[PDB]
Design a protein around this motif. Sequence first.
Motif, PDB file in Angstrom:
ATOM      1  N   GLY A  32       0.827  -1.194   0.000  1.00 12.17           N
ATOM      2  CA  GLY A  32       0.000   0.000   0.000  1.00 12.17           C
ATOM      3  C   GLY A  32       0.854   1.234   0.000  1.00 12.17           C
ATOM      4  N   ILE A  33       0.544   2.221  -0.847  1.00 11.74           N
ATOM      5  CA  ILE A  33       1.288   3.489  -0.803  1.00 11.74           C
ATOM      6  C   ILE A  33       0.339   4.661  -0.868  1.00 11.74           C
ATOM      7  CG2 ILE A  33       2.796   5.057  -2.100  1.00 11.74           C
ATOM      8  CD1 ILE A  33       4.050   2.127  -3.077  1.00 11.74           C
ATOM      9  N   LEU A  34       0.470   5.596   0.056  1.00 10.99           N
ATOM     10  CA  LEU A  34      -0.304   6.823   0.015  1.00 10.99           C
ATOM     11  C   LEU A  34       0.561   7.958  -0.515  1.00 10.99           C
ATOM     12  CD1 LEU A  34      -2.845   8.337   0.620  1.00 10.99           C
ATOM     13  CD2 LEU A  34      -2.222   8.315   3.023  1.00 10.99           C
ATOM     14  N   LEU A  35       0.030   8.697  -1.476  1.00  4.72           N
ATOM     15  CA  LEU A  35       0.681   9.917  -1.949  1.00  4.72           C
ATOM     16  C   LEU A  35      -0.039  11.110  -1.336  1.00  4.72           C
ATOM     17  CD1 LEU A  35       0.928   8.925  -5.730  1.00  4.72           C
ATOM     18  CD2 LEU A  35       2.660   8.542  -3.951  1.00  4.72           C
ATOM     19  N   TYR A  36       0.682  11.921  -0.540  1.00  6.62           N
ATOM     20  CA  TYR A  36       0.043  13.054   0.179  1.00  6.62           C
ATOM     21  C   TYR A  36       0.754  14.394  -0.045  1.00  6.62           C
ATOM     22  CZ  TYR A  36       3.506  12.863   4.075  1.00  6.62           C
ATOM     23  OH  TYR A  36       4.657  12.950   4.840  1.00  6.62           O
ATOM     24  N   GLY A  37      -0.012  15.470  -0.137  1.00  2.00           N
ATOM     25  CA  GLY A  37       0.560  16.796  -0.364  1.00  2.00           C
ATOM     26  C   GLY A  37      -0.494  17.774  -0.808  1.00  2.00           C
TER      27      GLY A  37
ATOM     28  N   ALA B 141      -4.397   8.509  -2.805  1.00  2.00           N
ATOM     29  CA  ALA B 141      -4.040   9.929  -2.955  1.00  2.00           C
ATOM     30  C   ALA B 141      -4.840  10.768  -1.958  1.00  2.00           C
ATOM     31  CB  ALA B 141      -4.267  10.401  -4.394  1.00  2.00           C
ATOM     32  N   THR B 142      -4.187  11.752  -1.340  1.00  2.00           N
ATOM     33  CA  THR B 142      -4.849  12.629  -0.365  1.00  2.00           C
ATOM     34  C   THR B 142      -4.251  14.043  -0.354  1.00  2.00           C
ATOM     35  OG1 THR B 142      -5.643  12.782   1.943  1.00  2.00           O
ATOM     36  CG2 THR B 142      -3.417  12.025   1.695  1.00  2.00           C
ATOM     37  N   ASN B 143      -5.090  15.068  -0.181  1.00  2.00           N
ATOM     38  CA  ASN B 143      -4.605  16.417   0.169  1.00  2.00           C
ATOM     39  C   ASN B 143      -4.447  16.617   1.686  1.00  2.00           C
ATOM     40  OD1 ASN B 143      -4.793  16.826  -2.602  1.00  2.00           O
ATOM     41  ND2 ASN B 143      -6.635  18.074  -2.461  1.00  2.00           N
TER      42      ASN B 143
END
Lengths: 319, 319, 54, 42
Positions: B50-55, B157-159
Amino acid sequence: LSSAILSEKPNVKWEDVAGLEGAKEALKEAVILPVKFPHLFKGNRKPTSGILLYGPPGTGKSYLAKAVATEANSTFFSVSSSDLVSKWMGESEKLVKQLFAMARENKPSIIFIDQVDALTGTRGEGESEASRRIKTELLVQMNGVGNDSQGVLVLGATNIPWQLDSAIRRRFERRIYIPLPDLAARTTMFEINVGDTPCVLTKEDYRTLGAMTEGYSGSDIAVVVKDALMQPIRKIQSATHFKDVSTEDDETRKLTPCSPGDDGAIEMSWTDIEADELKEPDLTIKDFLKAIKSTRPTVNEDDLLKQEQFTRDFGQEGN
Amino acid sequence: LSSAILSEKPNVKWEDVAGLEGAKEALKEAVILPVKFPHLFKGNRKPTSGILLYGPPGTGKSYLAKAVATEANSTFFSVSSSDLVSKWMGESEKLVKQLFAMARENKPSIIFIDQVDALTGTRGEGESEASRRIKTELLVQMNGVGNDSQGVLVLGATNIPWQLDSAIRRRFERRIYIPLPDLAARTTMFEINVGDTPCVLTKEDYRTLGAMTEGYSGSDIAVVVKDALMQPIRKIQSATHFKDVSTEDDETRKLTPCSPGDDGAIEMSWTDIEADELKEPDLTIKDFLKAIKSTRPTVNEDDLLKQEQFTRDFGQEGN
Amino acid sequence: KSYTKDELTKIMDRASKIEQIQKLAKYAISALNYEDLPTAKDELTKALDLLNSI
Amino acid sequence: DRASKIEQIQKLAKYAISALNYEDLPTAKDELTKALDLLNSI
Ligand SMILES: Nc1ncnc2c1ncn2[C@@H]1O[C@H](COP(=O)(O)OP(=O)(O)OP(=O)(O)O)[C@@H](O)[C@H]1O
Ligand SMILES: Nc1ncnc2c1ncn2[C@@H]1O[C@H](COP(=O)(O)OP(=O)(O)OP(=O)(O)O)[C@@H](O)[C@H]1O
């Protein structure tokens, strides 16, 4: 009508679970002992049929469940709050009825519900429409079988006990808090997590490993292990210069990554190296140190506030 | 039942992305290495899950996803959190179940979930209807095929990482910060976005731009580029005075916009003008200057502080 | 075998230092791709002196 | 000339990084020093 939900066999043994084996004792006595020696449960003593585990996420509650499944030699059914428990209207409850019927049919059986709190209501839209009647269905169905004869076991799991309403609580049997692993448990888990891969097997540093990691979960430990395990691989990827190590007494030549200045340091792409001639850097303490460095303060104290509050109030309590 | 998800090829290469080459390496190791050398996963060596990309929003998260899909060489599933919210009030998560079934049946597959801070927003009280059930559905379904035999990788993906719950946080693995581009990255993006137009010359102008434009996103850069590309069209539109430039060796006198005062200034409009006789204005620094005047910064620095705070807390690792 | 448990601090420190050096080197290469010699020089000098200190 | 010298610098950097990857500090030192001297010579 029925809709069969998995009875597949994980392969997680008792020995793969390190820690607070009083829970394991409760399990074995609640499940295996009844199976092994049924004549011990005649008359006014009747076997325990409800168990629900609570704590922070990542602490092997699911892992424990899988171990139980492995160890049961019984039918193991496992289902969530979203899984096979809705419709247009009405017949989720019927599905629940049909299920518990099937559970009775199959003695021994085990029902595992993850995240038991997610089946709750006291005021909102679900209290008006479904979730009330769902809760009611549950409560009624956990009533009579618990009286006298049973070959079903109910296994719960939750991170948030306090958002599961009071109605279930006292009607249900046995509850244990699953804390984060302590020094010893972390250490054991390290050793378990090393398996077959050689160097370094330093017994002395395992306790340092368990020391340095504090408050992290099983999941976290797993992640750190994996992270350390990619380090030799990342070396190899960044490696250019390789050298022979295995002598001509072995079947063939075997090359490993080596310091760029050395006599025998020949430079190429790792992709050119085939599996028969393949060798990897050993695992150092440094790999693990790095792995730890990518790991940060993982577990919030806020969990510890309410989980330790429920612990002070209920805790090892049956509920 | 199925709900059709597109898995076609958005042909965006590695080289079309700028920066965080270390996350790119993690991705190469997470997909490409598994594809290339699967036999390296015997024993205790196991794929990342699992990988979350956040920014901040607008930082090529979607763009990155496209590149991943191009580079995956396997089945790729993409979904927005907008999709599969509700149908009746009762039935939602069955679709999630079926989705994961489909993904499991296609190994290797990769699921990309956009805006995982939607579903799972999260805010209390109102969660207890269908949304808690969804939250549960995620957590339980990630537990299903996760051990032993995996061909699923989960990309989130998340802000807003800080509103994503503890429960997901230390179950769902590896989290990576996607920052706004720095001077270098901006410049490179400028150079990437050219087209056929000969434009203003050298690298000096590019580095001037990437320096001068700061605190802006890939999307913002793209906007500026489009603006500047349209500015000569805007010149053509607004000035109806044109003038000859090229010699008579071509098809005919080649006409470009000029001021009403200019010598050779004919004032007929675009309408009479033949395809060959066309001379677009060159792309000047002034287009980029006016573009910068039109470009306002997007994101408040408090958001930066919260992203930075999460980073101080969880950072370049799952936890 | 053979570990006093006070080495780990120095070890992780030196590892962080190595990482920083690596970063510096990468930045220098980036600067070279941009034909920015003075930056490259400064980053390599900073890596060099950082290497020298341990 | 200025192209091949940069390439050589890059190579030396790579060599330094390989050296560091195997904790060969003196090699790393010498390679970074050669890279820097060569950079100064451009
Ligand atoms: N001895 C152990 N103690 C705790 N966790 C372990 C142990 N051994 C392995 N694990 C980890 O347990 C994980 C299984 O899920 P886990 O039980 O942690 O979820 P959970 O805590 O039940 O949370 P959820 O209720 O959201 O599933 C595996 O991914 C594995 O890395
Ligand atoms: N290296 C890069 N870095 C950032 N953005 C880029 C890069 N290369 C291209 N882009 C831009 O990314 C845009 C695609 O949308 P983007 O991924 O920025 O949205 P997002 O970050 O997913 O935001 P949201 O999560 O709100 O949808 C394109 O318009 C494209 O010009």
